[PDB]
Amino acid sequence: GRAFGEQLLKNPLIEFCDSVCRGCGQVMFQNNTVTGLLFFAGIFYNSTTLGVCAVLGTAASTLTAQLLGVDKPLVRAGLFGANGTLAGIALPFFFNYEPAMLGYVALNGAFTTIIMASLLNFLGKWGVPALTAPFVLATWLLMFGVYKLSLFHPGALIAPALPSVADMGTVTGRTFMEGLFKGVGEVMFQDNIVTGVIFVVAILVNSRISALFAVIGSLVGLCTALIMHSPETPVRLGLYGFNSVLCGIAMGGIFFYLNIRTFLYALGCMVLGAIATGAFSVLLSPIGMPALTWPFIVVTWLFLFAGSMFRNIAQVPTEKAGTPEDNLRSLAI
Amino acid sequence: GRAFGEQLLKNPLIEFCDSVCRGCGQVMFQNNTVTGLLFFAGIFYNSTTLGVCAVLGTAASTLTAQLLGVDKPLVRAGLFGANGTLAGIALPFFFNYEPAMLGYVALNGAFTTIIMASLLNFLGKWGVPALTAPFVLATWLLMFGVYKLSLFHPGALIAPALPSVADMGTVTGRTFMEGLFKGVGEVMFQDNIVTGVIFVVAILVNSRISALFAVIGSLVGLCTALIMHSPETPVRLGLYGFNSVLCGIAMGGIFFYLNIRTFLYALGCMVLGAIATGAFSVLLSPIGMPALTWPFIVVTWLFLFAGSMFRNIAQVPTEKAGTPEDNLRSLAI
Amino acid sequence: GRAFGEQLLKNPLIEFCDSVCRGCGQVMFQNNTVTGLLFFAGIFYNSTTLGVCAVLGTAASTLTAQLLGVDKPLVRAGLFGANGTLAGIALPFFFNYEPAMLGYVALNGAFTTIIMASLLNFLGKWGVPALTAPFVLATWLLMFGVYKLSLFHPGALIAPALPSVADMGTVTGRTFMEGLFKGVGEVMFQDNIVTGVIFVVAILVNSRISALFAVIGSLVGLCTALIMHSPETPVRLGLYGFNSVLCGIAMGGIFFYLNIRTFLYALGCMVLGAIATGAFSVLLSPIGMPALTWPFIVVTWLFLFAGSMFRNIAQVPTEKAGTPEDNLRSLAI
Ligand SMILES: [Au+]
Ligand SMILES: [Au+]
Ligand SMILES: [Au+]
Ligand SMILES: [Au+]
Ligand SMILES: [Au+]
Ligand SMILES: [Au+]
Ligand SMILES: [Au+]
Ligand SMILES: [Au+]
Ligand SMILES: [Au+]
Ligand SMILES: [Au+]
Ligand SMILES: [Au+]
Ligand SMILES: [Au+]
Ligand SMILES: [Au+]
Ligand SMILES: [Au+]
Ligand SMILES: [Au+]
Ligand SMILES: [Au+]
Ligand SMILES: [Au+]
Ligand SMILES: [Au+]
Ligand SMILES: [Au+]
Ligand SMILES: [Au+]
Ligand SMILES: [Au+]
Ligand SMILES: [Au+]
Ligand SMILES: [Au+]
Ligand SMILES: [Au+]
Ligand SMILES: [Au+]
Ligand SMILES: [Au+]
Ligand SMILES: [Au+]
């Protein structure tokens, strides 16, 4: 609710970065300039290069939408920036630096908006959001072929093997302290406790409810994995949190009106997001590749598509969907 | 066509088991209380534990739909029970017993109805039924991650390997006798001739035509596999029947009006269901996992979606679709 | 624009081969009798057996549509022939001859039209074409199971392995000369320079623009692969051209109105088609199977679905879509 006159002051370059500011927030569904800025802050706190590659992905994807002529409202809301952000981080997270790295980030960001547009047209038939699938599909397509096209070289995180039952480690208070905040950091490939805290503060600025569901998701994803007898190391590193962080955020009052029934619904989703993390990890291990946020995407899509069938689960028209605070105030209109 | 007064006698607990009775029948698309009861009978004849785990899956999935508030008509028809039934059997069929087994069956049953609702909303745009895909997707998601989450331990049926050409065995009269009825038993993971016979009698009670297509499907799936030079062992064990049993049933006058053209159409589908069994078996072998009824699902979806394009193949509006006897009597309205 | 009286001369057997003539052209989206004839010519120039197996697939698929009762206009345009053509070549390209080869080609052709009908009904909701996906899905289903059903034996091109980084070879003028025309030949599994030239002449007969985009696609797919540091051998053999040939053709003024913006759009697609070739090749290597034209299909579907979102990219209503020359003349109506 800013003064309408402030628009006399808009030049297209400050309009562009506002798109970038919010694009980044929309990685965790927060349509908020400051949230995104603070996301950047947190990534930059962990690494300068991932910081620039996050910005370039966001910039590359947002620009591509404008060049292609996406409706200005979609572009202004950050929906064509979120997946670019992740496309820019994932690539130097998984591959060793080569000069061509930046060009490839540009390509991957550019590709995300093609796919964002694809999914919005496809899923639009059911009012289901595209979530972060543009980044997963683009990045898989650009990463899988690395054994056949040697421009980049895979980092040691990528190692083809048949799955098998492998030791177990030891749960300590640290397992919990570190798993929690890295769970949140790992939403954007940030192996860093402080970054994760920064990310919660960043969400908190836009919404207390979403910040709380981000914390809960991470805890739910974490203890689901221990209940399921994961080795301690993946769990301390937030590997079983971050899909559930995203579940927590999206289910926890953004796409459904927060109440006691929608809350239990969101709990179901956070748990299955952790279990699905094991599932796609295994499915992709013969080619050594990361499932990324596909466990969040599949589970969440499942719960979103089911919504219109369940009368005790109150769905938000996606056209409308704002923060959980705003959705409840709106329902009282 | 029961007296309407009989509803003065309905208490919610007898309403619940009627849902469970029919849920189970709907594993082979038979909206029939007695059929389901006899399915239970047959499973129980083979094993008491698979019997209870079948009931708990059915109970867990049906309850979840009611808790979530699915339209009472959908719940009363067993559509939210069929996939729960299978989710409850598959888990102790493939994994060794651990105390947590029952909770996990509850979880898996619960998950099926989420997915049932998902698919009904998605596929509803084309009037295409969800078949048994809720169970396949839920169970894959809950099974694949077992190498990474060690709560359960995979049975010896699960063994990651690269595919290769492997001896051939010897076809005998027994190959046929046993392959036929285990083909039907294996629709519900019942390695048992008597169970299979029980299952045919169970279908027969509701529909002679469906019982006949279940027999034919099994034979078609069986000899397709020999024509294709399968080793004798998978074929005697009904492994190449049961996807074709399901094809036979669904195509054979439930979703299409039985005539000479629809019959040949159903033959096409039963054959490709056998070939697809080899296909998904291979696709999933690097991670050692069962395709389950995915070969039936893909092929059948293909033929169902094609239906509205082929004018010589008379489709049933899925809203209406009852037994093959009732569909023909209805067409004569 | 032939005299309408010429239809007094039509007997159903000459109507049938006209369907076969155009079916074959429609493998590269050319609704043109002579183009298809010349495609046949070119295949036959390379091999007599692939020639007959191309015709039988085309014949088997086209007949199945007529037997099933597809709208005569769809059948007359070759849309139910293109995928049959490829189903007939792929099978003896990848498997050693066995007597049953021809029956299987008939089966595979027959299956393509089921899937053509499936996809047309499914994708019809967005006006998106089915491209060559009927052939990929049918052929995968009929090929993957070969390790479990030994009727055919895989040729040495099929060899299950975990991916890994493998020497590099040496780019010469020949890499380019041979890569270019085999890029075009390989659209139909024709490892033959002359065949490829024949194919360009064949397209040229129907459309200069499409013939040019076929050449460009092949070059773009080729140098993308070198930029990406592919070994020289796959590139000289046209393995990185043919998905991009198809991209080039479909994007280059058939499905979008050719202009400076649509051209850059098509460039994006051709590049990602090459990168996706590496991607699906890797994804399917644990089971040793060819991605075929899936890299073209996924990328192209992505750009097609995105179309209606991008206002600077002018889409063709698919109902209407003819050659790029005719689309521009139509836009001037
Ligand atoms: Au800025
Ligand atoms: Au800004
Ligand atoms: Au900014
Ligand atoms: Au900012
Ligand atoms: Au949003
Ligand atoms: Au950078
Ligand atoms: Au970088
Ligand atoms: Au715990
Ligand atoms: Au806990
Ligand atoms: Au009962
Ligand atoms: Au009962
Ligand atoms: Au009952
Ligand atoms: Au009963
Ligand atoms: Au039914
Ligand atoms: Au049990
Ligand atoms: Au059990
Ligand atoms: Au036979
Ligand atoms: Au037979
Ligand atoms: Au002819
Ligand atoms: Au002709
Ligand atoms: Au012809
Ligand atoms: Au011809
Ligand atoms: Au066309
Ligand atoms: Au032949
Ligand atoms: Au042949
Ligand atoms: Au080059
Ligand atoms: Au070049």
From Swiss-Prot, chains A, B, C:
Residues 13-28, 33-45, 171-188, 193-204 dip into the membrane without crossing it. It is a multi-pass membrane protein. The chain crosses the membrane at residues 49-68, 73-95, 101-123, 128-148, 209-228, 237-257, 263-284, 287-307. It is found in: Cell membrane. Keywords: Cell membrane, Membrane, Transmembrane, Transmembrane helix, Transport. One of its GO terms (biological process) is urea transmembrane transport. Urea channel that facilitates transmembrane urea transport down a concentration gradient. This is Urea transporter DVU1160. The lineage of its organism: Bacteria, Pseudomonadati, Thermodesulfobacteriota, Desulfovibrionia, Desulfovibrionales.
